[PDB]
Design a protein around this ligand. Structure first.
Ligand SMILES: OC[C@H]1O[C@H](O)[C@@H](O)[C@@H](O)[C@@H]1O
Ligand SMILES: OC[C@H]1O[C@H](O)[C@@H](O)[C@@H](O)[C@@H]1O
Ligand SMILES: OC[C@H]1O[C@H](O)[C@@H](O)[C@@H](O)[C@@H]1O
Ligand SMILES: OC[C@H]1O[C@H](O)[C@@H](O)[C@@H](O)[C@@H]1O
Lengths: 302, 302, 302, 296
């Protein structure tokens, strides 16, 4: 089946003690290949990302690489906690580029009352200067992204009304309609508790290739793969039974949150997918998948 | 009760990003007052000391102060990871001075196989140039120090066969005998999981004043105090029920490990004890106790 | 007439202790406005750039700003000392963008024998990944740049055969011809010892606007302005008598070399020129000139 | 003749860009061997030490070494500019240890009026905590040190009423008497313009070994050596004609002040003298002399 291949046993990005905003953890990064470079917009916290460590604030960093392994990083966050909806910061960004514009969906965590987090949108032409567009869906939700192109003249988003992956459609990026669930947890498996997107889906000749995450009943996080129909991505063509990535290395199994691999970004250079993922909500790693290796079992049964 | 009094709300020593060896954390320092100055031999790490990626290394720095609050620091470690037993460095030093010689016990962490850490001894005449004397006890152990004077013509050491404070005796500083436990955890209290020495004990008219640490069942670290008989320090005269120091300030409650105060050093100037402690395995603070405020309840009953 | 206006009394970029490559000095930066951002490719040294001990090495950093005053910076150099011609590093880069490609001329300092420095060229599409094209002129020379457009179908460069600004022409960026001097020092003035370009010239309706530097007989460095004919930039239309910028602030007057302002970069946003300059070969500042304020004295007489 | 031997072509101590107080120059250091270590109390400036660079302030740093070559350094100065006599800082310290106490003479530079500099004294038990004792001689003077032992029950100092090395005597370190010149410049030589002590003198079986400095008529600084009588150090028993050290390395010939070697410290371990010197008032080097090679 499909399995992501780690390039080494070492993270590609680690917290940096010198800078308070990224002193504890860097994880769950957006990623895109553009103009001959890999770019990360990474989630960073000052404190370990759980209440037992403290009142962490998530901010978004920028890193850049020629090879997708060795990164340079900017000294200050490119987005910081600047609104009420973002009092506790910005989480788990997903980025696509459409017609010259980068569209980032992230979760603004306000923590002012129960379930005070929202999918928010920001745009950029350059990945450094971000313009907030505000809340996308006025409801507790997260794990959101646009598709990287319009389909049938509409913007399409993925979201996560608990505990399923949902899709929705928009003409104007402000009003969303035709909400429906497209992927659900499966009882008594590695993907029983909840599912959500990983990074944004990638267009393939055979359909939309979507990496997803799931948690089991022991709260272990793994990645999986699903293929969606090109014209109607609400239709699942295939869903791989087995995970494509699971916690194996020491820094995936242990850290601020044990036994987590979690992706918000998949960059493509020359038909190789570079899947960036958080390990234990502490560091960032990379694992690859060649596009020619995207193969699902063909079957037909109700 | 005995309570340590913080000398300020700010650390007295913090990590320094420009020096790799102390970039992440400085904590758990030895301390001694000598020749009109306070001297720290501090534990320092290059990456967070709970990191599950890479291989953090502990090295020993030197700092010096006229007032016990405001420190100057040397730019390079006075002991670095130079033997196999110290591949991952030197931890949690405790120092005493006997007859012109400084005796430092530290934990050498090799990590070459299961439980590869050992109490090790180094000596110096000047606190800068250290001569390794090798492993003290050939067994997994830590939290060790000499007493600062011979007792009945013998050297006495404290150690920590799990989970109790132990003592032992030596005529030649090489062979240790009459090992016995002297202090144990108390169930259902702040000191239930484990106990260990803080810094080396301090001689008083009423007995040996020994600061100890303990962890509770949620791994919160606090300091306590016990008074041992002068001639036979295996005999506990009094043990304070309540802690003398617990995590309260932000940098004691939050850092690389939450809710830790941890001491390896207590310097004495003019009948005031300066207790140096790590906060959250991240920074170093100081709190005082005047000798006249060392008050315990004595008893006479089986 | 023309005077640059400082945007701040503080540097916009300073050396950073934590990073050895830029520990001592950041100065003499290239600059360009692109894709809604100001970008600096800055000269940095590990030790003072006038040190007579050791061997200072110049490497090239990257910084980026939305407003041209407040910069973010990458943690590693985008070009380091990687050839024999660059044993002592890369100096005083000038950048232009032509048809999607950035062309950087810098001085490679080898110091292997007498006068071992050369104008070298590197190209990039993104300002991060630089491809060396090698030595431009096989002779001791410096203070070089392309013009930001071809003229009459040719590439044009400025250089500095001592002590004058020179121009030369090329069809292929490898072979240069029609070398001629275009600007000379003026005896008994602030610009008596030597002249050289500042940043690359900027096209205006009235001609090429070229900031230049000069040294006086006491080695004080100031900036001036000259206007060159559009079609034949060897012809000077006007040269301002007085400097446009001179050392005034404390960090321009004092540092590793006293009384120096020195520019290698002039970014343009919305008809305002942002002139980045080194102060005292130690830090980087910014001063502006609106295009409408480019006014020279003209006359008509033999 | 006596020649100091450099141990390498590299400084032992250089300015540190991270710390403003020592960003430009470290030079002209005191030195002593004590308790198994070499200790430097070094002059440091924030700006090159000439008015053409700016209003430099001299402060005193601490460094320490096991081998006399490879130093560790403290992050802040052990003495900073804290009196009016020291507005522009503390210069060119010389240290001796007598009966458990370190005695440092330095120049306090106030620059408040013409010739506003004074020999000042500070003491310490540990080289870190310094107690000022104030101005030693109320006159423009510098290049001062105690001898490292009392002689005939008196403290003895060297000083520099311009342009000669002087000696003086004291019972109490406050009142100085029996001032006399002991060493003068020699016209038309490398030592024509002025002379001054280097580090404090060192006792030998043959007399007090004193390194001195001199400037020539082009302001080039070199070191020389003299031998003084043990009981009466006002009597010069030998003075070497040729210098023992002169600017040769690039960082001795060029820097903030060209063509300078200048010593304020000479540490002794196992019969070898380690002579620490400023090069070009910018960096610190070391050159050695074995005791058995002190031959006039
Ligand atoms: O901790 C595991 C996982 O839980 C969250 O809720 C996710 O959205 C991620 O932010 C994180 O990696
Ligand atoms: O992390 C808390 C505490 O646990 C360790 O095991 C101790 O020995 C100290 O090194 C440390 O401060
Ligand atoms: O030092 C002043 C000035 O002199 C050099 O030669 C120039 O090329 C610049 O590198 C520098 O700013
Ligand atoms: O500059 C050479 C020399 O001149 C000064 O006056 C001396 O006292 C030293 O401070 C210095 O090294």
């Amino acid at each position: 089946g499909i399995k992501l291949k780690r390039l080494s046993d070492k993270p590609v990005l680690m917290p940096k003690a010198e800078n308070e905003w990224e002193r504890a953890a860097v994880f769950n990064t957006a990623a895109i290949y553009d103009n001959g470079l890999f770019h990360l917009i990474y989630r960073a916290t000052d404190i370990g990302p759980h209440a037992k460590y403290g009142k962490y604030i998530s901010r978004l960093g920028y890193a850049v690489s020629k090879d997708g392994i060795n990164f340079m990083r900017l000294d200050k966050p490119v987005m910081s906690n600047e609104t009420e909806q973002e009092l506790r910061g910005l989480e788990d960004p997903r980025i696509v580029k459409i017609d010259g514009i980068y569209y980032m969906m992230y979760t603004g965590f306000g923590d002012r009352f129960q379930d005070d987090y929202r999918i928010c949108l920001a745009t950029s032409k350059n990945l450094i200067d971000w313009e907030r567009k505000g809340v996308v869906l006025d409801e507790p939700n997260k794990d959101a992204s646009l598709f990287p192109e319009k389909i049938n003249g509409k913007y399409v988003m993925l979201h996560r009304r608990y505990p399923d992956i949902w899709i929705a459609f928009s003409d104007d990026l402000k009003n969303w309609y035709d909400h429906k669930p497209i992927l659900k947890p499966i009882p008594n498996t590695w993907e029983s508790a909840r599912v959500g997107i990983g990074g944004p889906p990638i267009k393939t000749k055979d359909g939309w290739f979507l990496i997803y995450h799931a948690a089991d009943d022991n709260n272990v996080y793994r990645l999986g793969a699903v293929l969606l129909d090109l014209e109607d991505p609400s239709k699942v063509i295939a869903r791989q039974k087995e995970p494509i990535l699971e916690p194996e290395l020491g820094w995936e199994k242990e850290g601020y949150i044990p036994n987590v691999v979690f992706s918000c970004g998949n960059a493509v250079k020359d038909d190789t997918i570079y899947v960036y993922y958080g390990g234990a909500d502490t560091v960032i790693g990379v694992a690859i998948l060649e596009m020619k290796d995207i193969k699902f079992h063909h079957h037909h049964h109700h």
